[PDB]
């Protein structure tokens, strides 16, 4: 096409933004960044399509010009920034400490955290590599890069890096028993266990998972995201917990929790 696309149409946007068919032709086209745009969420969306603190991109960009935001400990003023999973976002003037994570519906759940735990996030490890000068370095799901880690970290693990210094802290491996978040697909948002792994060398290893309800479900390895140990979340969890109700049970909860 003689070049990349600086545009995005509505009805091509991610369905998990809960936008409308209508209100125009075009849509925000997330900028470059750590989070892949289908995997991501814009600032305007978190605000204007999840918070309703504002209406228009005018108001949004005005707010960002006021520098009202940090993101993982840093301001970012692009309306089309690609926010995403396990981000940390904090507001000062309202003193809101958020963290980005899906619903069990796979929708980027509004999970408010405290001032602490807006002091730590996780990074699942994409690759660890013997960088040059013999240096070891390693990168994360959220587009960062660190050197001199703990070497016992290995691929597919996660780590509790701190936030702003960087600075890996104690971390979590991948073996039987651990606790997990799901980051893609039909089981998206779900939470469970390691119960076994179906290693398929050459490609597409899978992981059998079991939620608290002994609902088993098996997923792609790459969508795996360790989050602590079983009965031991290293973070704060939203509502729903990746427990994956039936629509029947959901209905039941609607009509029941409705009333009084």
């Amino acid at each position: 096409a003689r070049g990349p696309k600086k545009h995005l149409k509505r009805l091509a946007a991610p369905h998990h933004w809960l936008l409308d068919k209508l209100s125009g032709c075009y849509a925000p086209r997330p900028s470059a960044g750590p989070h892949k745009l289908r995997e991501s969420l814009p600032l305007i969306v978190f605000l204007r399509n999840r918070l309703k603190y504002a209406l228009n991109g005018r108001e949004v960009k005005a707010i960002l010009m006021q520098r009202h935001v940090k993101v993982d400990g840093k301001v970012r003023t692009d309306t089309t920034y690609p926010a995403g999973f396990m981000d940390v976002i904090t507001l000062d003037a309202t003193n809101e400490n958020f963290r980005l994570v899906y619903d069990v519906k796979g929708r980027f759940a509004v999970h408010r955290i405290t001032d602490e735990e807006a002091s730590y996030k996780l990074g699942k490890v994409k690759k660890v590599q013997l960088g040059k000068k013999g240096v070891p370095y390693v990168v994360t799901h959220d587009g960062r890069t660190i050197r001199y880690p703990d070497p016992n970290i290995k691929v597919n693990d996660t780590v509790k890096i701190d936030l702003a210094s960087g600075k890996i802290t104690d971390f979590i491996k991948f073996d039987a028993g651990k606790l997990v978040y799901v980051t893609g697909g039909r089981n998206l948002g779900r939470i469970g266990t390691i119960v076994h792994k179906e290693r398929h060398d050459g490609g597409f290893d899978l992981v059998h998972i079991k939620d608290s309800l002994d609902n088993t479900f098996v997923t792609r390895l790459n969508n795996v995201f360790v989050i602590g140990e079983q009965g031991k979340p290293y973070i704060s969890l939203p509502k729903g917990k990746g427990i994956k109700l039936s629509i029947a049970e959901e209905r039941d909860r609607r009509r029941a929790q409705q009333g009084l």
Binding site: V135, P136, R147, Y148, D150, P151
Partner: protein, 218 residues
């Protein structure tokens, strides 16, 4: 034709109307940049000598240096070359143009005086036209007033007074390349940060090696 001559020492420029066939013929067969003594062309110009600079044809098409064969021609063109303003970058374009060479197809021709003759040329030689700017860079000022490395040019600078309707005020340029305590602070920042970060990375690698030593100890 008409003749457009400059006296660069004054900054003067002046046009004349030269319709004597015989005096005009003195320039045929010549090219740009050749020198010619205008004594044949006027006792007023006796002793004067001029270097051929340029000319336009009877339809406005110009000449150019090294573009021979005294006629009109289309050439493809680029940036950093006269007779053409490239409009968007990369653009290369064809245009017509007249030859380098003197010929009767030139309503106008333009020169610059090389050497002054005996006479004076009133409108051009008499008037002394001023240069529009002075130096701007500090080193330019330094050469311009014969200043040392130390001489503190700041006061030497030119200023231009300007009246409001009554309120007069001076205006002057803004020195670039000037050394300042800020620039010194900047290099200070840079140097300090460089060696600091180096030693930071050094000790980090040290801790890493320590851990590694324990791993083999175990």
């Amino acid at each position: 034709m008409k003749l457009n001559i400059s006296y660069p020492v004054n900054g003067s420029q002046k046009t004349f109307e030269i319709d004597d066939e015989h005096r005009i013929r003195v320039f045929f067969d010549k090219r740009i940049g050749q020198e010619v003594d205008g004594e044949a062309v006027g006792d007023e110009f006796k002793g004067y000598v001029f270097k051929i600079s340029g000319g336009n044809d009877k339809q406005g098409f110009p000449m150019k240096q090294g573009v021979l064969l005294p006629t009109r021609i289309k050439l493809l063109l680029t940036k950093n070359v006269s007779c053409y303003r490239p409009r968007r970058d990369g653009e290369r374009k064809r245009k017509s143009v007249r030859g380098a060479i003197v010929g009767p197809d030139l309503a106008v021709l333009a020169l610059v005086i090389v050497k002054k003759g005996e006479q004076e040329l009133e409108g051009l030689t008499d008037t002394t036209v001023p240069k529009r700017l002075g130096p701007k860079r500090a080193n330019n000022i330094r050469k311009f007033f014969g200043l040392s490395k130390e001489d503190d040019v700041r006061d030497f600078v030119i200023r231009r007074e300007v009246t409001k309707g009554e309120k007069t005020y001076t205006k002057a340029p803004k020195i670039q390349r000037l050394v300042t305590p800020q620039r010194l602070q900047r290099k200070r920042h840079q140097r300090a940060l460089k060696v600091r970060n180096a030693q930071a990375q050094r000790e980090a690698a040290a801790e890493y090696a320590q851990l590694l030593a324990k791993r083999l100890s175990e």
